Amino acid sequence: SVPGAPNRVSFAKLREPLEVPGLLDVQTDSFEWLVGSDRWRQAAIDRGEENPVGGLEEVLAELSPIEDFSGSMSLSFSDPRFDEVKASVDECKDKDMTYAAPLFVTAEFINNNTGEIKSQTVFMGDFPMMTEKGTFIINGTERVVVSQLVRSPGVYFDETIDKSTEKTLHSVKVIPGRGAWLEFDVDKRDTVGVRIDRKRRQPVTVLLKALGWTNEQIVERFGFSEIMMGTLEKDTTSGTDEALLDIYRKLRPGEPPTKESAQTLLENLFFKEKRYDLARVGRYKVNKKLGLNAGKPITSSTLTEEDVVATIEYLVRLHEGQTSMTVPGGVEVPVEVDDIDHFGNRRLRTVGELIQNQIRVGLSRMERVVRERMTTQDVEAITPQTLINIRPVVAAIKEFFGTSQLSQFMDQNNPLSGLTHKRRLSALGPGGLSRERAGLEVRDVHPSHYGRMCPIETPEGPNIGLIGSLSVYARVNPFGFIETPYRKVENGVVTDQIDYLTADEEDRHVVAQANSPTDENGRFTEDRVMVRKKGGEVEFVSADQVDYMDVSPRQMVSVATAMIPFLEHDDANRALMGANMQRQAVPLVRSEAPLVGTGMELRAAIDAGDVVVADKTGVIEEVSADYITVMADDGTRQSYRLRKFARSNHGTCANQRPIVDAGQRVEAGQVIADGPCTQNGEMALGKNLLVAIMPWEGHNYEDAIILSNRLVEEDVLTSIHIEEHEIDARDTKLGAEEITRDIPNVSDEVLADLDERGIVRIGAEVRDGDILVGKVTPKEVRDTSLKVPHGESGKVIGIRVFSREDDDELPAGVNELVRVYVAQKRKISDGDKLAGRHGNKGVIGKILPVEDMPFLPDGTPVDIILNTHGVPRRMNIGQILETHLGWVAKAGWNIDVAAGVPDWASKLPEELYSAPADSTVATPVFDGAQEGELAGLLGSTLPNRDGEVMVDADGKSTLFDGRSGEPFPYPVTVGYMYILKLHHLVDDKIHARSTGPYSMITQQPLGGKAQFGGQRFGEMECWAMQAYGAAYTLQELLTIKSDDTVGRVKVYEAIVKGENIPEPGIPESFKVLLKELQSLCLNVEVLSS
Amino acid sequence: EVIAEHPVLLNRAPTLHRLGIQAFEPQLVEGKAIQLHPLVCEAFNADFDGDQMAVHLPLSAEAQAEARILMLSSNNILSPASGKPLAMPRLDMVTGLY
Amino acid sequence: CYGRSMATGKLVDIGEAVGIVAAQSIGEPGTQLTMRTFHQGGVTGGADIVGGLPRVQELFEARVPRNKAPIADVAGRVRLEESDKFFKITIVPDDGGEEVVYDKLSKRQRLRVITHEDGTEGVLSDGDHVEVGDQLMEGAADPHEV
Amino acid sequence: ADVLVPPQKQEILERHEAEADAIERKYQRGALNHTERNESLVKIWQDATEEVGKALEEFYPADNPIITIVKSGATGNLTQTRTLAGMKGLVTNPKGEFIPRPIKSSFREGLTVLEYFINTHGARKGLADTALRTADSGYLTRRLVD
Amino acid sequence: FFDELRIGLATADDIRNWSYGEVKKPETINYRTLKPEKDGLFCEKIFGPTRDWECYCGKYKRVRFKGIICERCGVEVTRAKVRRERMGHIELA
Amino acid sequence: AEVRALAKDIARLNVADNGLCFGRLDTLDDARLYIGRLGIFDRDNDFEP
Amino acid sequence: VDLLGRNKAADEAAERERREEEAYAAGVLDLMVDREDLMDDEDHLLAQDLIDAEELADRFKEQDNRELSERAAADREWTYGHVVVDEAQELSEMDWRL
Amino acid sequence: TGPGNRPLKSLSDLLKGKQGRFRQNLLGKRVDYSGRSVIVVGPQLKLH
Ligand SMILES: [Mg+2]
């Protein structure tokens, strides 16, 4: 679909009926719903939704009206309006501003005592806006609000084994959007009890009577089960008033009751909308279950007596072991337990909904203050502006984007990292779950995840299973349930109609696999088909027993997983490792698209938003390293600013380079500038290297990697890293901090680079301890200059200075602020971690000279050597498949079709019959190059410059030993593999300490590389030292090196003075204990024996 | 001059047995990765796929003697649990000899 | 008494902390043993044989076995009776003069098996000869009885 | 070229498939319970996996590098070789039960979509299982050290 | 080095011997310039210099007086923060 | 998984060892159906019960 | 039994035993390596992320598993799923109440 | 109790409480003269 994409021949044999949707639509559509954008309104009104209502409109309608006790005063809100954004994205990121737009709402005040109306526009604050990239710019930084998985409101039934009697017991809980919980259960003694708002358990009949039920009505509705009759006959309460009084006592202990509040307490607690509601999603769920309020649309959001009675009846029927239940007048429904892990129950709070909830809290605070201050002002002159307090709402919005877990720094390590961050599904966070809740259980892969959450992607750290990634084809319901598309199938012929099914909908049908052999019109050729059944059970069924089919084999995978070639040949563990490692590859100075890859790099790169795409068709007018000018055919002129050597949140380079020249004609949507990790508009996370699979002198033992010096000489794996150093000058109790070129008691040479302001000049080389900006402070002055930390160096590439004298919005107390950016080129070196896309990872153990590497018969040295022993035992043989195909891509192929096409090539599309050298190919994850096709292509490779083929049909070549010169006795597998430079460089993992700062809380050495701390000497290390019998070393570690200050300094002086280290003894912490013992009149004495 | 014949203790957490800490003679090397002998990896349960290791410096004469005598890697070839050899050929070495 | 040191291959030296060495040697391979299920709910997994780490925990804590097997207090000849779900075993001591009875042995636990070299004597049965401390029922003997 | 597939892998499977069919047949007549039917299928497919492994071991030449590494004691097992070039075999539900449908495909051939999805379950389960086992190991080790 | 450690029950004479002086004044520190009281819980002459090298009267403030007793205070100003390790006694009627 | 499955099978067989067969049923078609604590099938005869 | 009721005493000793076991389990968890000090090639799940001190302490308790025929017969307050009464005419009214 | 609802400290609590020496911390110390770095295969090195 991309007008100007590079050609990449594909091995796919299936035809896609549906193209991948906007990958980051989950963010943009949600936010457009929040602000009620015109696009969202048009999209929603076309779906069938009548009179769409936005998030802001929803919360404002919920808020209004605001009225007093007498109902004389009223205040209403309407028409939320957004003005133009205050500053551009670039300016927002330059001046540490927030990308926000003013918000205006019309507030109308009504005074029934006179009937006069007063409408007025009220400024509600600067609402932060979402960029087209799906990010929020707060205080100059880029942030992503991750979607949150939460158990949707509804009614949930479960059965658990009693830990006392081992008995199975049934329970149900009603989970509302807001308000008191309501739980029912059957205990180990077959007594039905109810817990209202998590209080003490009491018989359910008490609540039934509290709702106005009489004994006759209870015995009529119930009585099908003897346990309910037993509970009723064994209840010491009779009458609605009696039950209401008992509930009052068990909810509000001690305080006097009254008939006035007896009914009111329950009515407010569960039935009045201003205190309890099911949020229009709990209402829908509770209607679908229990068969209540069927047919007619959702009209009210609150609970009803019918819901409570139906829940009780359902619980009792489930306990009795029944499977079908029918409420009087309702639709018959199944009786079953509810799986809380099923995406039919778990829903997704999108960014818009989280922001809406925070706005709701702020509006509640505003409602409280308005309710307070209407009484304290003259009703004959009050206006909407005097009543309104906008400090709480703006405070709530400002706090959500600050100290909140869901709003997180954007993962700007590379474009794919940010793209996967936006499509992240986080189960934790406010309201998600806590440390005390499910561990092993909630982290499992559930059958309902298919096509909705990727089963492979998950962060390596403590959040395995708790954080997932949205599938490529999935989308969110208005209720927040994740749908996925399927093709209709009728009479055994696959139909072209596509339906977005939710997990609950999907469980009711039979779905066939994407790779179903079908005729031209879609009729299944096989009499039997592989399908997924209701309970996630895979089965083989008749071709006429299928209702739906997967749109594509990529249905179940996400972007990074979809970017792994030959994924089906790799075990799930290594696939997960490769998917996660793709997310942390550092951009290189030169980008290079994979020689062998998937058909996903281009779309992922374009959707990530780090490539500049022409807004509309036009002719390139002027191209520079900084900006691109396009003269559109419509007459308008566009100018795109390019980011050059900009620092990412993680410290990587975000340089953008144009890929067009003046006078070129560009179609709308065409890529005109590449991002950090793209070549011509597609992912270029790594480099294609010539690899030989063999053990080599033990330098690649235990997953170590051997690199050719070419990768250092030609800057193949070189990267640019930018670090930021910040320093502020403030007020004090003794004066203020001053910045100047003058620093006391320092040499003239250490401040040579400093300019008139005392700031290091741009382009200056700075290393460990060099002064960046000189700052002098009151204790006759004291030096407090900023300096380069230990082991850091680079070139000064930028300075940003903010001052209070220039009306810069620095925080209170700060008078000035300076940021200095230092850039460094890092070559590839021993200890840096390299990895492929198949989970094969290792640190560089040796970088051999060019003439030491094994070299091909034509003299070409291999770039990397990988050990043979790593592959077979890890079931990541896909890395081998790639290695072969990567060769066939580097050297073109030509299938001989003289006497007809060969049998192995009968499936290859004709476009794959031949290709030139340095060609790029695409092999989708579950539909691509087959083993036989690849085997034939290996034998169909073109000759080299000299007219001979080096890699034979087996994929192996004879390699000469660069050191001894003799040919290796056996042929070795040689190919081209795409490898990544991961962000785990040894340059920022080496840490050492002889002496340094100490924690004043315990006097022990600090902990951390940035704190110049020491290594942990754990208790198990103490055990290991004890087993050696090394008493002296253990004592030295425990006493001198950690705790003893006097011994510490004594040993330091002894070492620097060249005398044998003294004997530790009589520890201070032992002297304190001895003196405490003496304080208790205990004559503690040390005996010489 | 000062690093010669001065043992250093290499350790890798978690330390599940005494052979998780071993004394070695240092050699100054270019680069910033610690070069570990292939045979002792089994004792450390270490693989060169990103693993890190900590280094401690004995200072006193008694500590240095303990490291040089009790804890030196060449003196701990046999595992204490069963007496079987531990610093013995592995992986590439086994296939090469085979 | 401790004897040859495994690490050095020579006689253990005075002062060596053999206790920590033994503790580490026994604990380090614990991860290879089978363990109780990590699932939060469900039935007790100890009903089926789980004789891995839980068995070691039971042994080192001297706790009574779940499938306790009574041991013979006296050597003699065994006479056995059976019922619907209980056995009634008795030992008549050859040198003794009093019958020693085991009256409440559930049938859900099997009898001991001999597996003689060539006689293939199989399961314990009436008329067999039992020594002191022999297991009468197939299971785990209680350390306190021993 | 050197990841060889035994030619007797297509026959064995179909033979066992017939047996599987028979089991389902007896289940349709009510001669089998669901859990017992799954147990029978699991046993049959375990036998099939063992047969495929034996065939793979027989077929491979002695000098093949893949089998050479395993037979020399360097790395891996014949189980991994079977999973690579034979058949993956049975996989477990998230609740630990075996799925009666085996993964008849091998990573050499490439797994289908549903086979891969069902395989992911135990793959993710192991990540938490390995972390959990260390807790029990450390508990026992600390008791022994004390 | 030592091989054994024993705790006995101290007689009044032993408690007296451990002490450097009586803590007679039930006050911790004054308010004006927060100077500890004489014979108080923080007395200079019993426990030593308040923090380091300063007697109560202040006429001895020089680091050289390692082995000098201030005549009026009687304070034996000494290094090693003796007041953290020197202890007193209280005679009770 | 395999260890627990095998242990469950062994425990089930041990439990069934006592009183394996409850009885027999003669079908009007003159067939025979043996009822007991375990399902035993002839794997060599199409798993006939 | 129902007329007199239970004295509702406090089981201080068992509670203290549970507290001590939980403290020991928490100490065991604290004995493991923390995330900050990990030397592994990549971050991974730790035992402390999945199990709490109370769960680990309970994991090592005896957790008796008596049979139902034993569990119910020893519990005066057990509610049975079904009751069969042979020669039922002989039961007194109080037996029927029970 | 006096100021605030907190009991007055006593000497015996210095011995009983987790403060002091008798009750262990069960946590590792951080030690000087220590370092940490990535490891690579030194095939040329001798065993010591
Ligand atoms: Mg590792």
Ligand SMILES: [Zn+2]
């Ligand atoms: Zn004085």
